């Protein structure tokens, strides 16, 4: 008999491997497991953790987001590392020359990077040209910009986007949504 102060046999609650059956992603996890164990640079631990992430935890990083990251002071010649998908952005009309190391590139993103004299890199070419993650810049896409996150924590006076199928007048704009009909939220 032991007076337990915690839950016994509690899992860590973190992914220790990707849920995917992608053999190439398992190869990348094998390489960055070696590089997290044997290098003791914190980049490799971060990249190994980020390789486990799900599709909603790997939002796409736009090329405009990459260019805004290179507009930082002294970050213009770093290697932008996106553990995920790099997507195109037609809203930006001037993309610089840079090295981007990502899992996937869309065709427009790859064309926009290599049109400006840049270079698109996989995460193992990054591992051979920056094994401690020297001169790198990890970028992450926006997580709370997802459409599902609008409805999270829905309640009174939270302003959190009702789960609705059709949107308009007659569709939840009445008693409970204005002073005149009933009350306001």
Partner 1 sequence: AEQVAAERAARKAANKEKRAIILERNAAYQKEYETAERNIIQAKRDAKAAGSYYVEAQHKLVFVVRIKGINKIPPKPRKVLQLLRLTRINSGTFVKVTKATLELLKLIEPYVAYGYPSYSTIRQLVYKRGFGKINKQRVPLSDNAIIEANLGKYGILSIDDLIHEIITVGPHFKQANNFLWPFKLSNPSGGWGVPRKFKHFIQGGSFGNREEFINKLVKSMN
Partner 2 sequence: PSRFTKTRKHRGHVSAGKGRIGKHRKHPGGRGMAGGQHHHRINMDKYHPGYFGKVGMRYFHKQQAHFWKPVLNLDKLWTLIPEDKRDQYLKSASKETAPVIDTLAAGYGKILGKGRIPNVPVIVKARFVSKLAEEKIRAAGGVVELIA
Partner 3 sequence: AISKNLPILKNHFRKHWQERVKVHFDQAGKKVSRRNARATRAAKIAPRP
Please report, as ranges, the residues that interact with partner 2 according to CB under 8 A.
Answer: 90-91, 93, 154-156, 162-163, 169-178, 181-182, 185
**Contact mark string toward RNA, 151..170, x via CB under 7 A:** xxx---------x-x-----
Among partner 1, partner 3, partner 2, none, what does residue 165 contact (CB within 5–8 Å per kind)? Answer: partner 3
Nearest C-alpha neighbor of 72 from the set 118, 120, 137 = 137
**Contact mark string toward partner 1, 3..22, x via CB under 8 A:** xxx-----------------
Among 51, 109, 120, 138, binds RNA (CB under 7 A): 109
Q: Closest CB to partner 1 among 1 and 155?
A: 1
Phi, psi angles (nearest 5°) of residue 104: -125, 150
- Calculate the CA dihedral of residues 158, 162, 168, 172 and round it to 10 degrees: -80
Q: Please count the residues of the chain.
A: 185
Q: Evaluate whether 91 touches 97 at the Cβ level (below 8 Å).
A: no
How many other CB atoms sit within 10 Å of the CB of residue 79?
Answer: 19
Which segments within the chain are labelled E, that is strand? 61-62, 79-87, 99-105, 119-121, 136-138
Radius of gyration of the chain, Cα coordinates, nearest whole angstrom: 22
Tell me if 76 contacts partner 3 by CB under 8 A. no
Q: Which positions lie near RNA, rule CB under 7 A?
A: 1-2, 4-6, 8-10, 12-14, 17-22, 25-26, 30, 33-34, 37-38, 54-57, 60, 84-85, 87-90, 104, 106-109, 147-148, 151-153, 163, 165
Q: Which positions lie near partner 1, rule CB under 8 A?
A: 1-5
């Amino acid at each position: 008999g032991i007076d337990h102060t915690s839950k016994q046999h509690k899992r860590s609650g973190h992914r220790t491997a990707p849920k995917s059956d992608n053999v190439y992603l398992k190869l990348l996890v094998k390489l960055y497991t070696f590089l997290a164990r044997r290098t003791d640079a914190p980049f490799n631990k971060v990249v190994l953790k980020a390789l486990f992430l799900s599709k909603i935890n790997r939002p796409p990083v736009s090329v405009s987001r990459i260019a805004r990251a290179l507009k930082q002071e002294g970050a213009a010649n770093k290697t932008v590392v996106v553990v995920g998908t790099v997507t195109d952005d037609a809203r930006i009309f001037e993309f610089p020359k840079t090295t981007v190391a990502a899992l996937r590139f869309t065709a427009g993103a790859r064309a926009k990077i290599v049109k400006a004299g840049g270079e698109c890199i996989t995460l193992d070419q990054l591992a051979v040209r920056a094994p401690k993650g020297q001169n790198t810049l990890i970028l992450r896409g926006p997580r709370n910009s997802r459409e599902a996150v609008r409805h999270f924590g829905m309640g009174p006076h939270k302003g959190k986007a009702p789960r609705i199928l059709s949107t308009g007048r007659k569709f939840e704009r009445a008693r409970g949504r204005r002073r005149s009909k009933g009350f306001k939220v």
